[model samples]
Target chain A: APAEVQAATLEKFIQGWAGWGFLANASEDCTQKTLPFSSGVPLRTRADTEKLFPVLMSLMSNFTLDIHNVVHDAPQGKAVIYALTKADTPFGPYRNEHAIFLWFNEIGDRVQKIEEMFDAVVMQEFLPKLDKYVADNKMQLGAKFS
Target chain B: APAEVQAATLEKFIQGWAGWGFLANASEDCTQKTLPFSSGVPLRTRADTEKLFPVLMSLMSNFTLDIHNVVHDAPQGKAVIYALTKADTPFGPYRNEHAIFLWFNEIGDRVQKIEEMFDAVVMQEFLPKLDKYVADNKM
Candidate 1:
């Protein structure tokens, strides 16, 4: 695919994330990876990522993402999304202002990897719940979040 | 400007940053703001940014940025640059593997803001020298 077209595709994927609802069949391939800002482990496969999402959402069930902007570097096959995210957590309502960087694999037209950066303090507040969820679900923690 | 064209422009601006050298008269406008990864304060104006550049460079006298990729959202006037950066600091050699997000002001055809994110460990290693550079450079 041409760089410009790929850029447009990526923009659509980012903007449509909330509506996509599940990672099981999102634009990312089954082999994709993700590094959550708060987690030490990386979700290595689509299933791994899928399993983790519900756990995360259950903790903050009413999650909402408001995208402020999207940037794409067509030649480099990358995009960055800037957004404000909010959720209802056990601790209380949680909100974050951050950016998510994504890399695309041309062959599959899918996201290959994701790296996110946000306020550490906000993440810290949910660590215990995330850890417990992982434990209770028997989810394997590894080097990638697919 | 069209989003596609804007993406290309942002790509050029990011790829051209290292070449522009110091902030005094880089391709960006004098009113741009920069929030460097390691610093707590934001460089509010071209002059303010220029004042800090030499201080920063003097500490890391041989600083270099190797851009690996550039991404843009033209309509939103935003871009993110992924790169490997290295420098020689008073403490020793310093390096960072990170990304920088940029915002452009279309009306001025110049950058409006810059926010960089890098490894905390790498930044912590140079905090002493950076803090001292800010102090002693009363050069």
Candidate 2:
């Protein structure tokens, strides 16, 4: 794929995530890996991650993505963006710095994988509280297949 | 600057840091920021950050940089790498995942700035121990 197209695919993936509904722009077998704090909690596969949308929606609001930089390696089918994530959650205002990596599919039209590294110290502070909120309210942790 | 040159500059920076002697390839105005765990503790300016060399050396050993991926944007003068850091420390073993971002100089030969995001959960756990060791050993 040309660097242009490969970069386009990555842009599309970012747009998908910006909407917080990523399934549409990803491959069926897409995998998302988050680093440090939530590394063990990633929901694998597109089918599985689709369930995350509702849960995230329930937990956060006033969300925004502040992108600082975007770098792409066309031949390697890799891209990474350094950005800030801001949102409001039940625990309090939430903000995290992130470096998100992506791998493009063969045709360079879909994202096949992601590795998202964020401010784990902030996340570590927030996770248990989030879990308690979810448990206390008996909120749906995932969405049903649509 | 050309993408190739921009990328080369970034590579040089990685090499400098891998050697734990980042002072050589960085411009005098360079600033390095480590997010979230140590965001408040950034060492700004080459002269200021130079003080960090001995401090880090005093704390770690057997350090290695395992680069997983590198991406560059020549026009933006930016590049980022996903990698791992492993080392031996006074308090314990250390390993942290990182996504390191760098900005190249106008001529694309020197690194002008850096923002490093790492596994802050691991960092948070390790830092107090490191500080105590530094104080206890009076180094």
Candidate 3:
């Protein structure tokens, strides 16, 4: 695939990152690794991704994703989308930057792996607050990661 | 320029990150943003990049960078390299993952911007230790 094709496809894929349909392009076995919490394997497959999204949405609403840039290597079948995400939570308005690393198939059309990397510096502060928000609301984080 | 050219050039640039000559190809006014410590403006230009090199090297002795993968977008003149960095500090062996985003010139020959993003979770822990080590060694 040409670089242009991969870049365009990735752009569409990320557009769905907030609440759209990026998962359609992911393979059944598509694995996800969310860092820098590398220790916990909270998310694994598309199913887990589906489960996690709602959990996040429940905590934060009015999600807006602004893709800052994207880089795709046709030869390596890899791409990274840098974007900023803003949302509203009970705590307050939330914003964070992310660099999502993706691995596509040989043709660069189907995604095989997704590694979600966010600004952990922000997470360091937000995670605990989010937990408290959930606990305060008696929100059950489903077994998937609830 | 083609994606291959941008990808390959960015590869060479990252290889020199541990203290070689990546700065040579940087545009004179090339700006660097190191995050998620985005608060302070420590690095501003090619000269700041030059200054930063020695400061990091002074703390970590032997440095090795393993390039895991690279993504380059020709049309956007942007690229990201995901790599693992290993170094020896007074504390012990250190390793972290970095996703470096680079913006190149129109021809993709000269890099005009660089945003160095690292595993800030690891940084949260390593930073304090690094500071203490620097204080202990007084170097």
Candidate 4:
């Protein structure tokens, strides 16, 4: 059961990677495994998983969070305005605040979607950290940022 | 100092954790460096950074890296969008994209800042291969 959970989780992660356009090499050469619940598609791989982890880390590390509110609705979940802060150090000096609609899956274990409400104050503050994340991670494709 | 950098990063993480509302156990008293970064105004502590290494490792193990779409502008010295994708499982079909716009300092490494961009589209296709990294050699 644990293995299944791990396998299923890994599968979703791989697919998520490809969907994000960050698949290491972006190919069907990846592996996949079938979950007891996932009847149709059942094969995922290591290269695929390895491809996106680093990119993800680099993204998270370069900024900060300030959650104002979160709603636990099923698929069409909702969240309130929160601070989106960034800085030169990737530490922070929270800049703007905005509302976001968080989308959750039936299982709740997966976040299937999301939508955000923005402003010029916040949008003006978003680019730097994002740029830093891309530059920092791209130095080594698909390498973990720790 | 490397120790100070580690401490600052840890502090950032704690505030981040509290801010995102993930591991709420990281209250003001909780000393776990990796507890998550709540906010810059989080209660500051003076625990020896070395002692917090193991705690940080545990924090790292708690989550999986899903996907990311990041755009950096060198001329402007910032990130336009640092869109991150994640799921409870490593492999997933329905991936959520949370796009946060980062507004940083002139040099963009002193104090971090950001905002959310609503223009996010959840890919209708299968996203492949995401995983939790094992072992923090540096830690």
Candidate 5:
């Protein structure tokens, strides 16, 4: 597929998940690596990612991510997405934004890796809260996502 | 300028800085924000950046950054550069690397903002040493 076409497809796919809360279109390859700005360590698999997100999502209700820009570099098979996200979390109503860079393999078919940069201080404040929430709701947190 | 031409120019510009230690060619606007993976907070000015780089450079001597990839979406005026850097620092030799995304203004010319991401755990190990190095050397 042409680079432009791939870019469009990937953009749509990302928007589907982030904007509409549709998860199936997103990548779930357990082996993919994700480096989130607030995390002290990288999450290396889908299971690790899942362990955290369910709790985060539950706590941050009515989450919404609005993409402001999508930049695709076809030759390099990469995309930089700028977005603003808002949600209500245990600590308070959360509002922050950042640019996330996603790299794709040669085919530009799917995301190979993702790295996001945002307000680390804000996220850091909720780490303990997130941890406690995860532990308290292990039964629900561990459940597989649809 | 054409999008393709702009892409090529940005690519060369980034590669030149990384491979040749050509700091002058890059943007030095003090007020622009830079998000370095190792730093806990964003550096908001060239002054802040200057204070940190000297110490970082002194500790991590013989700095060499090899560009692995350069991606630019001219339409959006954004460039994402992936690179590996090797250097010797006061703590020890540094081998951590990362992908830096730079956003340019509408002309696809000057850089407006930068955000980088890498192995935080690895980079975190050197922060204290960097701080100490900054104070101890006064050199």
Candidate 6:
């Protein structure tokens, strides 16, 4: 899939897991910025994403689209906000992370931003510290200060 | 030192180890809050702050504050954050709970907050839930 296609697919893949499983032992390999934790395996590089897409697809192979709520915060901006209670997935037995995410991209089709808000405590403490460091130094992308 | 002085000293006493320590088995009247775990102790309230501060001071008198980062976020605000790391103590002689907290009132002298940052995980989970219930019911 193209980069945009891949981004959309990745977002859908995450949405599909809302009530599928619980995120446990979620940790960051600050070295790789991978979130490999207990129940939920952290996704790091493009290779991890490439491999993950198929696995997610197989799990949600039976589903179509169960879009709950979509909010366009701005008209001119290419960003989109999604709030959903459920989504159809190839996977069996949905669980609720009760996920919310904001996706944005520049005109060049590059992933300019992806902000995900989910229920997890460790991540709550970890992300703010990590995000501050990365954005201050300009080490990563899709990071915008609010 | 006298008990009152010991309580005063406990707030500033330097110890070897760091982390919050509760009395082995304090009286219900002595301990206002239940200990988070079987191994822990509840904090002494402001009413008993002077009398209760000594237990912690005993530990401080033993170990010392070798590693400390005092960030007085709001010494004048409603919540005063005072934290320190002990070099060693009775709890295995390494990094004990020497976190001395004084929750000062409007005048910044009467402590309304006196919680050791030890059991931070539990406090982080609990205190907010208590407030949220209060907030939800408009208590």
Candidate whose lDDT is highest: 2
Instruction: Please provide, for model 1 over B1-139, each residue's C-alpha lDDT reduced to its tens digit, 9 standing for 90 to 100.
Output: 4666555556566555565333422344535432232235555666677776667666665667777656766656767776777777667877765666776666525566776655544555566667776677565
After superposition, the stretches of candidate 2 with alpha carbons farther than 4 Å from their true spots are A37-43, A132-146, B133-139
Query: What is the fraction of true interface contacts found in candidate 5?
Result: 0.35
Cα DockQ of the candidate 6 complex? 0.02
Tens-place lDDT per residue, model 5, B30-118, is 24343432244655575676666666655666778777656677666677766677787656677765666677655554555666655
Candidate 4 C-alpha lDDT tens digits along B49-111? 234443433333334333233333333333322233333333333333344433334333322
Distance from true position, residue B122, model 5, in Å? 6.2
Docking class of 4: incorrect
Candidate 6 lDDT by residue in tens digits, A9-122: 335544544434212111111111211121132334434433333444444433433343232222222222223233344223432222222223333223333333222333
TM-score of chain B of each: 0.70, 0.86, 0.79, 0.32, 0.75, 0.35
Q: What total of clashing residue pairs does each candidate reach?
A: 14, 0, 2, 71, 3, 31
**lDDT per residue as tens, model 1, A1-146:** 56766665675665556653445224545443222222344545665666656666667766787776677666567777767777787677777656677777765366677766554434555665567656766766632221
* Sort by TM-score, top down from the best: 2, 3, 1, 5, 6, 4
Deviation in angstroms for B74 in model 6?
A: 38
Tens-digit lDDT track for model 3 on A47-143?
A: 7666656667777778898877777666678888788888888778888888888888766677889887777776667767765665676756542
Clashing pairs in 5: B30-B45, B30-B46, B59-B89
In TM-score terms, candidate 3 sits at: 0.82
Superposed by TM-score, candidate 6 places the C-alpha of residue B34 at a distance from the truth, in angstroms, of: 30
Return the top candidate by TM-score: 2
State every prediction's TM-score relative to the real structure: 0.69, 0.85, 0.82, 0.25, 0.67, 0.28
For candidate 3, the clash count comes to 2
Candidate 6 per-residue lDDT over residues B10-34, each given as its tens digit: 3433221243333322223332332
- Can you tell me which runs of candidate 4 are displaced by over 4 Å? A1-64, A72-94, A125-129, A132-146, B1-139
Which is the better candidate, 5 or 6, if ranked by lDDT?
Answer: 5
Q: Tell me how far the alpha carbon of residue A145 in candidate 4 is from the true structure, in angstroms, after superposition.
A: 17
